[PDB]
Amino acid sequence: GTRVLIVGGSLVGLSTAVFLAHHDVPVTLVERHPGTSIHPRAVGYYPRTAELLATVGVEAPAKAAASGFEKHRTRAGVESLAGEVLFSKEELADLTPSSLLLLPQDRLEPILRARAEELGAELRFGAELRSFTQDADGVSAVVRDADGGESVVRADYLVAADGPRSTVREALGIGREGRGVLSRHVSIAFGADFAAVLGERRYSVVHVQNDRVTGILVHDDTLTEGTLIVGYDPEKGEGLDDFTDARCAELVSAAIGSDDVAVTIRSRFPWDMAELVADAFVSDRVLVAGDAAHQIPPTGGYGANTGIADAFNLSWKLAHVLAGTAGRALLDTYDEERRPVGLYTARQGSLQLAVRSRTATEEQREAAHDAMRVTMGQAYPSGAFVADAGADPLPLTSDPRTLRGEPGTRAPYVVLERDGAPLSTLDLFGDGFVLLVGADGGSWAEAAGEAAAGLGVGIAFHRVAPDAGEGRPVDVHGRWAEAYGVGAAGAVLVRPDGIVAWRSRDGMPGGAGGRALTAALRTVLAR
Ligand SMILES: Cc1cc2nc3c(=O)[nH]c(=O)nc-3n(C[C@H](O)[C@H](O)[C@H](O)COP(=O)(O)OP(=O)(O)OC[C@H]3O[C@@H](n4cnc5c(N)ncnc54)[C@H](O)[C@@H]3O)c2cc1C
């Protein structure tokens, strides 16, 4: 019944459910909590993340939800929201059609949950993974339901999206490396009448510091929901268990500073600022994604972005393995591609925290990359792609504006029109393998047909030409070939995650094209 089991119904588990169900993989997700967290948690989704979400129709509703928060421009430090304001303060179009999406996680997760359900994912909230075993043929997961009933779920694979203290990662005996836990926090979600203390003021984030509380205060778009994130110090013997119902009510009222405002405490969750990355992201039939694979310091919000990109990398790979169109070795490329990105991103998170806290060395400032380089400029060191002979390999990340279709990088964004309606290369990706060819590459259609039939895998062919007739994509400024680093007779094979798999810079005469594409796609698919 269930081919992939997902543990965790937070951002990465739900992203995995959407991407898997998009690729028509039967999915069961278990989440111990009775629904999605109301905590805002990570709030910034970079353009690359938005492009990923675009492929499953989540970017549009997420942008709609984000416009509600767009007036929240002011960052402030205050004694309390009602009291003294200490301080306050407030072009990618050639690279990406997406902008930074400023939407709290508690608003993105319902959109993902809704889309996974639409696509036919089975989501079980109030369901706890107790333990699992795996064998040559599959995974057997003990799940305890909301009624305390147990049952054993049999899946082909298990994706562990079960967060930083992942009992799955620990049960596999996967260790982690990195600088470790930097500070311990509690996120306190509450309802309150914010409008009565804000008046016309709208904040992105408020730093609260008075004698009774220090922490970070946020209010939602409706002005009815907030979150106070406070530190505790274990070397004073303080712990999560000190954050009682009464203690949470005291901290929030101290942060608001009014007492006429009625506060309803919803829930408290622990959260650590940490730099910890799993030594391996794949163990036989278990894949580890998101916070379970990498705890990333929050400065820059790279963690949430990195986890959605993990879900996107692994989901089509499971689909092809489960379809028998790929060898099981294709799953190991999830580890190959994503672990180095995870470890690099965790270190970039640590640099950003150092720079932000004004404790960075000049070397740390020199090492710190733009968020666009960190999230859109990746070149995987190796994995499910064929590198260009002779080509100087790329470093793990570059200025994404400098990328020109190198295998292991994001297939570049080129603006197209189809029947006068705007399109881009990115719209062609996300469903299946795609072969793009230049104006002089009409013969690559037959090569795509030959490769597709040989390997029993779909290949969508699009010649990209600056005239193109009815129903075909027009390259309206003739930039496709230069952007994809090929000649007008060349072709580029793009994976279902929009990463370049292979290219031919030049034409290939007769059946040579078909033979070369079949060989390349056979390597990519571990066959
Ligand atoms: C309170 C809080 C505040 C945060 N604030 C920030 C922030 O300000 N900035 C930032 O960048 N990131 C922040 N994060 C982290 C961010 O939310 C994560 O990076 C993001 O959600 C991706 O993590 P994930 O989905 O892989 O795992 P998580 O979000 O950790 O979710 C894991 C899920 O697995 C579930 N689970 C665990 N064990 C089991 C089990 N045995 N059976 C079933 N379900 C299980 C958990 O209940 C949970 O819903 C915060 C996280 C928390 C919890």
Author numbering: 5 to 94, 101 to 537
Study authors write:
To investigate the spiroketal synthases, the crystallization of GrhO5 and RubL was attempted under low‐salt conditions in the absence and presence of native substrate 3 and stable shunt product 7. While no RubL crystals formed under the tested conditions (however, crystals formed under high‐salt conditions, see below), yellow rod‐shaped crystals of native GrhO5 (without 3/7) were obtained after ca. 4–6 months that diffracted up to a resolution of 1.75 Å (for summary of all refinement statistics see Table S1) and enabled structural elucidation by molecular replacement. The GrhO5 structure obtained in the absence of substrate adopts the acceptor state (=resting state) similar to three closely related group A FPMOs from bacterial secondary metabolism (RdmE, anthracycline biosynthesis, RebC, rebeccamycin biosynthesis, PieE, piericidin A1 biosynthesis). Notably, the FAD‐OUT conformation in GrhO5 seems to be stabilized by a tryptophan residue (W281) that is properly positioned at the re‐side to engage in aromatic π‐π interactions with the isoalloxazine ring. The GrhO5‐type I enzymes including RdmE, PieE and RebC typically function as aromatic hydroxylases and exclusively feature this W fingerprint motif. Presumably, the observed CT complex is caused by the aromatic sandwich π‐π stacking of the indole ring of W281 (W289 in RubL) with FADox. Taken together, this provides strong evidence that the “OUT”‐conformation of the FAD observed in the crystal structure also predominates in solution. Hence, in the acceptor state of the spiroketal synthase without substrate, the direct reduction of FAD‐OUT and uncoupling are impeded. Hence, instead of being thermodynamically controlled, this kinetic effect may be caused by the gatekeeping W281/W289 side chain that sterically blocks the re‐side of FAD in the OUT conformation of RubL to prevent short‐range hydride transfer by NADPH in the acceptor state (as similarly proposed for RebC).
Recently, two group A flavoprotein monooxygenases (FPMOs) (GrhO5 and GrhO6) and a flavoprotein oxidase (GrhO1) were shown to mediate the drastic remodeling of the 3 backbone and subsequent spiroketal pharmacophore formation. First, GrhO5 generates a ‐spiroketal moiety as part of the advanced intermediate dihydrolenticulone (4), which entails the rupture of three C−C bonds and a CO2 elimination step. The functional homolog RubL from rubromycin biosynthesis was shown to catalyze the same reaction sequence, pointing toward a universal strategy for spiroketal formation in the rubromycin family. In this work, the combined crystal structures of GrhO5 and RubL suggest three interconvertible catalytically relevant conformers, hereafter referred to as the “acceptor state” (FADox in OUT; accepts substrate, no reaction with NADPH), “reducible state” (FADox in OUT with bound substrate; reducible by NADPH) and the “catalytic state” (FADred in IN with bound substrate; reacts with O2 for hydroxylation).
